[PDB]
Design a protein around this ligand. Structure first.
Ligand code: ADP
Lengths: 70, 186
């Protein structure tokens, strides 16, 4: 005969019960703007790299000093 | 006072006073550094590691090898090694002794000049000498003439020595030492 408390509470409840809507709204929306940094993890990477390769390590001494021998 | 000798024949590194039968202890001349973010905040970060300490610690450390082909690659690293060796093993101060240096023969002057420059300046040390392997090899083996083959960690040698003299033209010098062989092994 009506639209009621009973039905309004039904709608309210259903809203509360729907996990898909609210969880998707929070998680999927927040998922997209996720990331911006010059990561320190990559600072580690870079530093290690610096330590990594003979072309820096040996050559820095050997090209520089064996220039002048005598 | 008393007199002290470093062996820098490559591989583990050998140091000891005159007249002891054998050096006090010996170290690879590995050098190594961290590879990973340091994530125990409780840990003290030390950024470079050497010697059996490293030999234990190795896994996250990664190695640099400061002597190629008997030629010592990176001076300041050597200086780290050297300082460590004196203080940690030797409990010795640079003033304390003459010090004797051990050299691949027939190799670039630079090792001579910087080695001496550093060790007289950075260390301050009563007396210095650098000596060619074969001479020692004879003295220990006690035959005044000879020819020596010694293929160490580093560059591999032929020297005939006659009694009391050098034949520097005679001499052959080769980068064939066991390290490169080992890398062939893989
Ligand atoms: N038990 C062993 N058997 C065979 N070779 C070894 C053994 N221990 C060490 N070596 C090798 O001997 C060398 C040790 O360095 P060393 O001979 O002192 O070189 P250097 O002549 O430059 O001083 C390295 O090549 C090392 O791999």
């Amino acid at each position: 005969x009506x639209x009621x408390x009973x039905x309004x509470x039904x709608x309210x409840x259903x809203x509360x019960x729907x996990x898909x809507x609210y969880x998707x709204x929070x998680x999927x929306x927040x998922x997209x703007x996720x990331x911006x940094x010059x990561x320190x993890x990559x600072x580690x990477x870079x530093x290690x790299x610096x330590x990594x390769x003979x072309x820096x390590y040996x050559x820095x001494x050997x090209x520089x000093x064996x220039x002048x021998x005598x | 006072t008393t007199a002290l000798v470093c062996d820098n024949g490559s591989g583990l590194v050998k140091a000891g006073f005159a007249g002891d039968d054998a050096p006090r202890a010996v170290f690879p001349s590995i050098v190594g550094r961290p590879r990973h973010q340091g994530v125990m905040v409780g840990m003290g970060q030390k950024d470079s590691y050497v010697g059996d300490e490293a030999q234990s610690k190795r896994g996250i450390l990664t190695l640099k090898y400061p002597i190629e082909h008997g030629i010592i690659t990176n001076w300041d690293d050597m200086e780290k090694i050297w300082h460590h060796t004196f203080y940690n093993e030797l409990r010795v101060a640079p003033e304390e002794h003459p010090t004797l240096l051990t050299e691949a023969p027939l190799n670039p002057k630079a090792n001579r000049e910087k080695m001496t420059q550093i060790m007289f300046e950075t260390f301050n040390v009563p007396a210095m000498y650098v000596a060619i392997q074969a001479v020692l090899s004879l003295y220990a083996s006690g035959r005044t003439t000879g020819i020596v083959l010694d293929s160490g960690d580093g560059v591999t040698h032929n020297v005939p020595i006659y009694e009391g003299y050098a034949l520097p033209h005679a001499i052959m010098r080769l980068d064939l030492a066991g390290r490169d062989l080992t890398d062939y092994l893989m």
